[PDB]
Write a protein that binds this ligand. Sequence first.
Ligand SMILES: Cc1nc(N)ccc1Br
Ligand SMILES: [Cl-]
Ligand SMILES: [Cl-]
Ligand SMILES: [Cl-]
Length: 163
Amino acid sequence: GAMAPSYRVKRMDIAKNDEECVVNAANPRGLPGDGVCKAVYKKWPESFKNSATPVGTAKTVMCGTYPVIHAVGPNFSNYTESEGDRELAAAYREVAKEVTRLGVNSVAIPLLSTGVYSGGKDRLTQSLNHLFTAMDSTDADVVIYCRDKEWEKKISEAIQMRT
Ligand SMILES: Cc1nc(N)ccc1Br
Ligand SMILES: [Cl-]
Ligand SMILES: [Cl-]
Ligand SMILES: [Cl-]
């Protein structure tokens, strides 16, 4: 792991990340999809070979030697809040498991279920807190990727708060 494991946030395309592996905000079917999943498909197409996996699970596929962790958050359009929250928490726990297994010293990670899977609600706080819950026991440097200027500020504040 990292000498002094940290959390950082950057506002840029997760496809340009400077970490040793990437988490895809995947769909259950391994399809190219939209947003983060679309940028990941353009950058690491070979990682979509057998990436299909259930909601609340993560599955890694190697693009050369660069690991892509396909993590499937719930679509809050189809889930109840209660059940959605359970599955979102589970996606992140499976990401922490995979980051450990792979022995990386850094990971680029997006906020699962905050885009087209959000059911039209702001889930920054909800998703970030499940991220921290899962990843706080890992020693990898975590870099969170986002695209909104206000979200960058709010994620930045939440990281500094607990430091
Ligand atoms: C970090 C990121 N990258 C993309 N390419 C699309 C959406 C988001 Br959020
Ligand atoms: Cl960019
Ligand atoms: Cl999403
Ligand atoms: Cl964003």
